[PDB]
Design an enzyme around this catalytic site. Structure first.
Site, PDB file in Angstrom:
ATOM      1  N   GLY A  32       0.833  -1.189   0.000  1.00 55.12           N
ATOM      2  CA  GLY A  32       0.000   0.000   0.000  1.00 55.12           C
ATOM      3  C   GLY A  32       0.867   1.238   0.000  1.00 55.12           C
ATOM      4  O   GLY A  32       2.079   1.175   0.223  1.00 55.12           O
ATOM      5  N   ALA A  33       0.225   2.372  -0.259  1.00 48.48           N
ATOM      6  CA  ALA A  33       0.929   3.650  -0.303  1.00 48.48           C
ATOM      7  C   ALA A  33       0.144   4.730   0.432  1.00 48.48           C
ATOM      8  O   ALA A  33      -0.932   5.135  -0.007  1.00 48.48           O
ATOM      9  CB  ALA A  33       1.185   4.068  -1.743  1.00 48.48           C
ATOM     10  N   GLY A  34       4.979   7.285   1.807  1.00 50.56           N
ATOM     11  CA  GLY A  34       4.725   6.458   2.971  1.00 50.56           C
ATOM     12  C   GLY A  34       4.166   5.097   2.607  1.00 50.56           C
ATOM     13  O   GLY A  34       3.034   4.769   2.959  1.00 50.56           O
ATOM     14  N   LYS A  56       7.205  -0.561   6.764  1.00 50.81           N
ATOM     15  CA  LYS A  56       6.723   0.783   6.486  1.00 50.81           C
ATOM     16  C   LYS A  56       7.904   1.735   6.353  1.00 50.81           C
ATOM     17  O   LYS A  56       8.857   1.678   7.137  1.00 50.81           O
ATOM     18  CB  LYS A  56       5.777   1.269   7.585  1.00 50.81           C
ATOM     19  CG  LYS A  56       5.289   2.694   7.387  1.00 50.81           C
ATOM     20  CD  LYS A  56       4.115   3.024   8.290  1.00 50.81           C
ATOM     21  CE  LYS A  56       3.655   4.457   8.068  1.00 50.81           C
ATOM     22  NZ  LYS A  56       2.348   4.738   8.719  1.00 50.81           N
ATOM     23  N   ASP A 155      -8.317   7.068  13.065  1.00 55.42           N
ATOM     24  CA  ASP A 155      -8.674   6.653  11.712  1.00 55.42           C
ATOM     25  C   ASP A 155      -9.135   5.197  11.727  1.00 55.42           C
ATOM     26  O   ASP A 155      -8.669   4.363  10.948  1.00 55.42           O
ATOM     27  CB  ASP A 155      -7.509   6.862  10.744  1.00 55.42           C
ATOM     28  CG  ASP A 155      -7.947   6.818   9.289  1.00 55.42           C
ATOM     29  OD1 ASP A 155      -9.172   6.769   9.040  1.00 55.42           O
ATOM     30  OD2 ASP A 155      -7.071   6.829   8.398  1.00 55.42           O
TER      31      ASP A 155
HETATM   32  C1  LIG Z   1      -3.113  -0.037  17.150  1.00 53.42           C
HETATM   33  N1  LIG Z   1      -2.213   0.632  16.192  1.00 53.42           N
HETATM   34  C2  LIG Z   1      -1.462  -0.022  15.223  1.00 53.42           C
HETATM   35  C3  LIG Z   1      -0.726   0.919  14.487  1.00 53.42           C
HETATM   36  C4  LIG Z   1       0.221   0.669  13.353  1.00 53.42           C
HETATM   37  C5  LIG Z   1       0.763  -0.617  13.133  1.00 53.42           C
HETATM   38  C6  LIG Z   1       1.659  -0.892  12.077  1.00 53.42           C
HETATM   39  C7  LIG Z   1       2.085   0.093  11.166  1.00 53.42           C
HETATM   40  C8  LIG Z   1       3.076  -0.245  10.010  1.00 53.42           C
HETATM   41  N2  LIG Z   1       2.859  -1.554   9.348  1.00 53.42           N
HETATM   42  C9  LIG Z   1       1.859  -1.863   8.367  1.00 53.42           C
HETATM   43  C10 LIG Z   1       1.604  -3.195   7.902  1.00 53.42           C
HETATM   44  C11 LIG Z   1       0.609  -3.466   6.934  1.00 53.42           C
HETATM   45  C12 LIG Z   1       0.325  -4.864   6.419  1.00 53.42           C
HETATM   46  C13 LIG Z   1       0.664  -6.088   7.018  1.00 53.42           C
HETATM   47  N3  LIG Z   1       0.243  -7.174   6.246  1.00 53.42           N
HETATM   48  C14 LIG Z   1      -0.385  -6.659   5.127  1.00 53.42           C
HETATM   49  C15 LIG Z   1      -1.010  -7.312   3.998  1.00 53.42           C
HETATM   50  C16 LIG Z   1      -1.581  -6.583   2.980  1.00 53.42           C
HETATM   51  O1  LIG Z   1      -2.197  -7.164   1.867  1.00 53.42           O
HETATM   52  C17 LIG Z   1      -1.583  -8.312   1.264  1.00 53.42           C
HETATM   53  C18 LIG Z   1      -2.631  -9.281   0.658  1.00 53.42           C
HETATM   54  C19 LIG Z   1      -2.566  -9.239  -0.905  1.00 53.42           C
HETATM   55  N4  LIG Z   1      -3.837  -8.819  -1.455  1.00 53.42           N
HETATM   56  C20 LIG Z   1      -4.794  -9.772  -0.921  1.00 53.42           C
HETATM   57  C21 LIG Z   1      -5.501 -10.413  -2.161  1.00 53.42           C
HETATM   58  C22 LIG Z   1      -5.142  -9.560  -3.319  1.00 53.42           C
HETATM   59  C23 LIG Z   1      -3.792  -8.938  -2.953  1.00 53.42           C
HETATM   60  C24 LIG Z   1      -1.542  -5.146   3.064  1.00 53.42           C
HETATM   61  C25 LIG Z   1      -0.938  -4.519   4.155  1.00 53.42           C
HETATM   62  N5  LIG Z   1      -0.346  -5.243   5.209  1.00 53.42           N
HETATM   63  N6  LIG Z   1      -0.119  -2.414   6.428  1.00 53.42           N
HETATM   64  C26 LIG Z   1       0.167  -1.162   6.902  1.00 53.42           C
HETATM   65  N7  LIG Z   1       1.109  -0.833   7.843  1.00 53.42           N
HETATM   66  C27 LIG Z   1       1.542   1.386  11.383  1.00 53.42           C
HETATM   67  C28 LIG Z   1       0.641   1.661  12.442  1.00 53.42           C
HETATM   68  C29 LIG Z   1      -1.096   2.174  15.103  1.00 53.42           C
HETATM   69  N8  LIG Z   1      -1.993   1.996  16.125  1.00 53.42           N
END
Ligand SMILES: Cn1cc(-c2ccc(CNc3cc(-c4cnc5cc(OCCCN6CCCC6)ccn45)ncn3)cc2)cn1
Ligand SMILES: [Cl-]
Length: 277
Positions: A32-33, A34, A56, A155
Site C-alpha cells: 500500500g501507499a 509512505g 513501512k 482513523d
Molecule cells: C493499534 N495501532 C497499530 C498501528 C500501526 C501498526 C503498524 C504500522 C506499520 N505496518 C503496516 C503493515 C501493513 C500490512 C501487514 N500485512 C499486510 C497485507 C496486505 O495485503 C496483502 C494481501 C494481498 N492482497 C490480498 C488479495 C489480493 C492482494 C496489506 C498490508 N499489510 N499495512 C500497513 N502498515 C503502522 C501503524 C497504530 N496503532
C-alpha cells in the site's frame, strides 16, 4: 502537579532492542501507499529462518518533519507492546537511515477488501455471521487495549483492519480527513478523544455487517451531509446486523460523547452476545 506528570511515549528514547540489520531485508511487492511493502526478514526471530514481514517507510522526498513523525509512530508501537489484535512491531532499521518499521504480515490484507471479495459467498470456506461477531469482538478488544494505554487511533475503519491466519483481526494505520467515519465534534471542532474513536467504531460495525458497503450511500460529502449529521441523521440497520449489534452502533453514534459507551463496555456487551449463541 510539577512532581507528577504523564510519561509521553514519543519523548522516550528509541529502544535499540528493536534494531535489525537492514541488509537482512529483501523487499517484495508494495502492499500500500509512505509506502508499506512485503519483505523477507532473514534471521529476524529465529537465527536461521526467513520470515515474511511488512515494512513501512517514507517516500524518498520526505523532509525533516516527516522523518521524525515515523520515529514517533515507532516509539508508540514500542510503548504499546505486543497485543493479539494490533499489527505488532517486530523491529526497525534506524542506523543511518532511512527509517524502516518492521511489523507483522497479515496474508488476507485489509478487512474491507476481504468482505467485498466474500460478498457473494456469504451465508448467515464461507464467510458467516459467527465471523462477523468475532471480527467486531476482536476490534473492540484491540481498541480497548489502545484506550487502556491512553492512545486514540483517529482513523478507525475497515480499511485499517487487517486479517491474518486463524481469522484474527489486527488494528493498523496506513489535510484530507475521513469525514464519513468522524464524530461530529471532530468535524466541527477538530477535537479527537476516546469517544470519537467509539463513533468511528460504530461506522466500522456498519461496514462490517453490510459486507463492505460505503457508509452513507448516495450521500456526497457536502453542505447537506454536515447539516444532516448535525441534526441527528443516522444510518439505518445493515442487512445482516443482529439487533443487539445495531443497538451498539446507535449508542456509538450518540451526539453526546459522554453518553457513548466505552470500548471496555463494548467488549463485554459483545461477549454476552457470543456467549448466548
Ligand atoms: C493499534 N495501532 C497499530 C498501528 C500501526 C501498526 C503498524 C504500522 C506499520 N505496518 C503496516 C503493515 C501493513 C500490512 C501487514 N500485512 C499486510 C497485507 C496486505 O495485503 C496483502 C494481501 C494481498 N492482497 C490480498 C488479495 C489480493 C492482494 C496489506 C498490508 N499489510 N499495512 C500497513 N502498515 C503502522 C501503524 C497504530 N496503532
Ligand atoms: Cl493523558
Amino acid at each position: 502537579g510539577n512532581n507528577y506528570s504523564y510519561i509521553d511515549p514519543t519523548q522516550l528514547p528509541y529502544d535499540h532492542k528493536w534494531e535489525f540489520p537492514r541488509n537482512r531485508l529483501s523487499f517484495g511487492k508494495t502492499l500500500g501507499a509512505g509506502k508499506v511493502v512485503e519483505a523477507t526478514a532473514q534471521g529476524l526471530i529465529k537465527s536461521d529462518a526467513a520470515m515474511t514481514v511488512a515494512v513501512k517507510m517514507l517516500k524518498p522526498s520526505a523532509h525533516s518533519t516527516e522523518r521524525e513523525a515515523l520515529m514517533s509512530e515507532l516509539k508508540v508501537l514500542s510503548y504499546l507492546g505486543n497485543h493479539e489484535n494490533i499489527v505488532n512491531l517486530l523491529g526497525a532499521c534506524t542506523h543511518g537511515g532511512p527509517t524502516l518499521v518492521i511489523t507483522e504480515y497479515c496474508c488476507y490484507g485489509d478487512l474491507l477488501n476481504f468482505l467485498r471479495r466474500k460478498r457473494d459467498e456469504f451465508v448467515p470456506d464461507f464467510l458467516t455471521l459467527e465471523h462477523l461477531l468475532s471480527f467486531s469482538y476482536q476490534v473492540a478488544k484491540g481498541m480497548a487495549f489502545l484506550a487502556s494505554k491512553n492512545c486514540i487511533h483517529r482513523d478507525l475503519a475497515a480499511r485499517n483492519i487487517l486479517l491474518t491466519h486463524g481469522n484474527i483481526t489486527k488494528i493498523c494505520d496506513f489535510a484530507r480527513l475521513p469525514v464519513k467515519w468522524m464524530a461530529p465534534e471532530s468535524i466541527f471542532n477538530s477535537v479527537y478523544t476516546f469517544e470519537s474513536d467509539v463513533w468511528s467504531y460504530g461506522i466500522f460495525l456498519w461496514e462490517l455487517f453490510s459486507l463492505g458497503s460505503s457508509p452513507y450511500p448516495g450521500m456526497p460529502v457536502d453542505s447537506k451531509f454536515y447539516k444532516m449529521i448535525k441534526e441527528g441523521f443516522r444510518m439505518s440497520s445493515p442487512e445482516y446486523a443482529p439487533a443487539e449489534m445495531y443497538d451498539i452502533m446507535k449508542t456509538c453514534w450518540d451526539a453526546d460523547p459522554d453518553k457513548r459507551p466505552t470500548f471496555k463496555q463494548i467488549v463485554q456487551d459483545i461477549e454476552k452476545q457470543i456467549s448466548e449463541s
